[PDB]
Design an enzyme around this catalytic site. Structure first.
Site, PDB file in Angstrom:
ATOM      1  N   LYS A 125       4.300  -0.639  -1.665  1.00 24.39           N
ATOM      2  CA  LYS A 125       5.319  -1.279  -1.662  1.00 24.39           C
ATOM      3  C   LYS A 125       6.729  -0.793  -1.930  1.00 24.39           C
ATOM      4  CE  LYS A 125       2.605  -5.820  -1.580  1.00 24.39           C
ATOM      5  NZ  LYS A 125       2.607  -6.818  -2.627  1.00 24.39           N
ATOM      6  N   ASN A 153       4.135  -5.781  -7.355  1.00 22.29           N
ATOM      7  CA  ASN A 153       2.946  -5.369  -7.732  1.00 22.29           C
ATOM      8  C   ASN A 153       2.369  -4.142  -6.556  1.00 22.29           C
ATOM      9  OD1 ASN A 153       2.574  -6.698  -5.191  1.00 22.29           O
ATOM     10  ND2 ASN A 153       0.816  -7.643  -5.683  1.00 22.29           N
ATOM     11  N   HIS A 198      -0.286  -3.080  -1.278  1.00 23.68           N
ATOM     12  CA  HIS A 198      -1.041  -4.012  -0.661  1.00 23.68           C
ATOM     13  C   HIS A 198      -2.206  -3.458   0.024  1.00 23.68           C
ATOM     14  CE1 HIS A 198      -1.906  -6.738   2.620  1.00 23.68           C
ATOM     15  NE2 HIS A 198      -2.117  -5.833   3.318  1.00 23.68           N
ATOM     16  N   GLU A 252      -3.672  -5.743  10.865  1.00 19.05           N
ATOM     17  CA  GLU A 252      -2.634  -4.970  10.231  1.00 19.05           C
ATOM     18  C   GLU A 252      -2.212  -3.655  10.721  1.00 19.05           C
ATOM     19  OE1 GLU A 252      -3.301  -5.516   5.986  1.00 19.05           O
ATOM     20  OE2 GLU A 252      -2.746  -7.549   5.979  1.00 19.05           O
TER      21      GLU A 252
END
Lengths: 153, 153, 152, 153, 152, 153
Positions: free
Chosen positions: A13, A116, A119, A130
């Site tokens: 991320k 965080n 993913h 995805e």
């Protein structure tokens, strides 16, 4: 369909890129024995992000989530191997870093759930979705690691 | 009282210093995203140690404990961040290293509970007391990490 | 004697092939455990059948013996407080899918028939394994400079 | 034109991917302070390889070199920063690993020149050419690291 | 006394900001050098002008002082055989572009005005720097358990 | 006589064992791509040590050297690969650790020449002699690494 050929989507991320964690995350998967299938570095468009997070469209945090995920570049990847979806999630640690234990990626490297760093797909079906969202089939590499017969029965 | 500004007291014990673990321990806090507030290297007086361990004064082998903790220098530290008291303890692992999980500081680097290399405050209230015991307010550094907005929402 | 407990740890052929010998040794050294014996060898099936005698009733026994005879291994003995039980915890679950991040198997391998490392499951089996793989002459006695900072 | 915005092309070769060095190589560049601009994982076609190595077309080893570079997948990348071309080459070590010193990528991780795990551009002009060969402009990411003012005057 | 030489090493504001304090400390610990003093502080310009007094004739002096006053630093003292000269070698060239891989600056930074760390350039300047940044009370004397395996 | 099958003798000295460097040293050889051939842990007799150091018997403080090398256990090893004798020495660094460059084993991990943690053969001929001195031929393991064709052309 083969168990050992399962694939998952792992993405660094924007906070993970900013904080210099790209190599360390990739190393965790390599050293485990998982096989790289796809890799890139991209600023995800809001269009793509709205598809990735489509299930969350009605949530009040959705616009802010999309804006945040569009606030810096990310590293989408695909990894292959036996139970790579569930084992990947194990390696990442709990989604909320507060609950992620030392040894996990989130447990070692971040603090708060909104930052965080990473993913991973939560199921085989969501992984397939995805992978198709973030990559085209020609970006998925088929190859055979020299170490394969020392990693798999 | 801001959640993200919580502070805890972490101290490398004499065995941690002797066994060359100071840098490794600091690195675990830095890489997690916690913020260093104070740091020193000192040989703690028995007087100070008796205050720090006051809760154990009526329990077995207190003079032995005090003498051992006065047998070599220590590295007192203060770290800041969201739930740093509780998360710090999680990063240290269980106090008895046989119970500490691999991935934790005690889990990875020591064996026996009286030679367990590190201390962390057990609650916000004990942290406040320990910080005040080991440091002067002038030693607590105020600063802002460049990466703050990638660590906290 | 408590602090003198010993366990048998062995890097399996897949651990050698995938360049994990030093990493595994480092995990025990940094923990504070003491090296007692170390070697590098291709184990015979005769030896491996004795090592895995407890498993001889299982369908996977011949495959385990054959596989363990397919490349060299690194047998070792480590000493310290509760090193058998703590050793097992450091290795992680026997099945790597169940081994947690932070453990040797959790960090470094995927499938149980390629689970890189063996550790004794109890003091008694450790005593047996140590005697099988090493001569008493190969077990070195010495005392680490750091001992008094590891044990009271 | 700005000195700090210089870019170079770094590629993990097929042996580097096979031997699990992708994360470690990326980490070397991240920890140094260099900035990722582009990243992908691909099986390079002989067509692309014949362009990359076009200067070598008449050499007797050329066909074997192309065949070898087409024998497994590679990780092409672009990195940005002050003197990243020449400093990149320094980080990689001598082209012949025999002469590469410990601390360098080749010095730490490989042995023989025909399996020398990594490539870096040898000059600013050759970097610009290599970047244009291996990437399109839309794959080059522009972003600003939070740490920029702590890395650059 | 040879083995008791001391040098001053300091993590600069950019070293703190980029999370290199532990890594730097670890490099000296693993080498065998002995920690003598350590702290974390925001240095005043008054102190920094004394620290950099040797450079006061240079055009970059005010910028160096201002920059070094822009974030906190980690002053330290390390002890051991030829620690001043060997320390400098471990840090690498002052200009990171010239610092070789394997050195602190070579591995971790890019530009000389953001070169993460300071080390004393000679015994005499080390003595001066140690006295400037620390009180004698803050210099701890103790003896590492491993000493006889580091020095004869 | 095959170049790639050259072998050298590498030994962790008593201080290297005492200071917990055995694994780190082995890892440096593995990650480079060299092949382990033999490994043991032993307390070397003065008799064996006098043969190993025969060249120093008429030089200062020979009994002192022998006594020191007989004061703790050592880890004798044999490693195989292209120019492993010369490259091994380069990886160890200069014999006096003040001259050893950062990145090398001695450079990173020790200080004084008589406490310099490791030995490596200085030539192919001395390697042959040292290997024969410290090991029996039955202890030299014959095997083929899976990654061989990605390390050697």
């Amino acid at each position: 369909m083969a168990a050992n050929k399962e694939r998952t989507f792992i993405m660094v991320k924007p906070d993970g890129v900013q904080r210099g964690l790209v190599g360390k995350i990739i190393e965790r998967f390599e050293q485990k024995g998982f096989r790289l299938v796809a890799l890139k570095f991209t600023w995800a468009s809001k269009e793509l992000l709205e598809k990735h997070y489509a299930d969350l469209s009605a949530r009040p945090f959705f616009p802010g989530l999309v804006n945040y995920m569009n606030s810096g570049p990310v590293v989408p990847m695909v990894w292959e191997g036996l139970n790579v979806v569930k084992t990947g999630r194990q390696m990442l640690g709990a989604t909320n870093p507060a609950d992620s234990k030392p040894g996990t990626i989130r447990g070692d490297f971040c603090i708060q759930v909104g930052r965080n760093i990473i993913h991973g797909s939560d199921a085989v079906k969501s992984a397939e979705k995805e992978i198709a969202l973030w990559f085209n089939e020609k970006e998925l590499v088929t190859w055979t690691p020299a170490a394969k017969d020392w990693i798999y029965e």
